From a paper:
Single domain antibodies (sdAbs) can be generated from variable regions of heavy‐chain antibodies, which lack light chain and CH1 region. In this study, we obtained two sdAbs (sdAb A and B) with VH‐like hallmark residues and low solubility from an alpaca immune library. To obtain sdAbs against Nlgn2, we prepared the extracellular domain of Nlgn2 as a recombinant protein and immunized an alpaca with it. We employed site‐directed mutagenesis and introduced all four VHH‐like mutations (V37Y, G44E, L45R, W47L) into the hallmark residues in FR2 of both sdAb A and B (denoted as sdAb FR2 YERL mutants) and prepared the FR2 YERL mutants as recombinant proteins.
Because W99 had the highest SAP value among the residues in CDR3, we hypothesized that W99 of sdAb B is a key residue for surface hydrophobicity. Therefore, we prepared an sdAb B mutant that possesses the W99A mutation (denoted as sdAb B YERLA mutant, the terminal A corresponds to W99A). The elution volume in SEC indicated that sdAb B YERLA was eluted as a monomer, even without the addition of Arg. This result suggested that the W99A mutation successfully reduced the surface hydrophobicity of sdAb B and improved colloidal stability. To confirm that the mutations did not alter the overall structure of the sdABs, we conducted X‐ray crystallographic analysis for both sdAb A YERLS and sdAb B YERLA. The crystal structures of these mutants were determined at 1.57 Å and 1.62 Å resolution, respectively. We were unable to assign the residues in CDR3 of the sdAb B YERLA mutant structure due to the weak electron density. This result suggests high flexibility of the CDR3 loop, even though its length is relatively shorter (10‐residues) than the average CDR3 length. In contrast, the W99A mutation in sdAb B CDR3 resulted in an increase of T m and ΔH values. To create sdAb B YERLA, we mutated W99 in the center of CDR3, which might be involved in the direct interaction with the antigen.
Author numbering: 1 to 101, 105 to 119
Amino acid sequence: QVQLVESGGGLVQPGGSLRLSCAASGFTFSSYWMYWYRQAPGKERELVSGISNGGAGTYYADSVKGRFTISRDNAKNTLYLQMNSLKSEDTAVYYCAQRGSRMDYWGKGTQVTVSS
Ligand SMILES: [Cl-]
């Protein structure tokens, strides 16, 4: 069975950093683009970042460019999101996802709270 498990969330002050990890299981990880999404309870789901099969291509929401960096380890089957220069607006549940090559797969999410 496919499973995605996010970790690395927490409570930090504006300007601080976190690193999210997404431990993937139960599929051929390196055959897929992998993604981070987020949702703040008041708001709609938003794509945060994506990374190509082997990592040469990346995509970022304009609002996270220069702050967040997506990367992956195709042997450890782990996706990462380095989050620097955190802002209040970044407070959200963060979810990793595989969106196929037609099934979608989602983790249960990790809470990031940016607050003084
Ligand atoms: Cl928290």
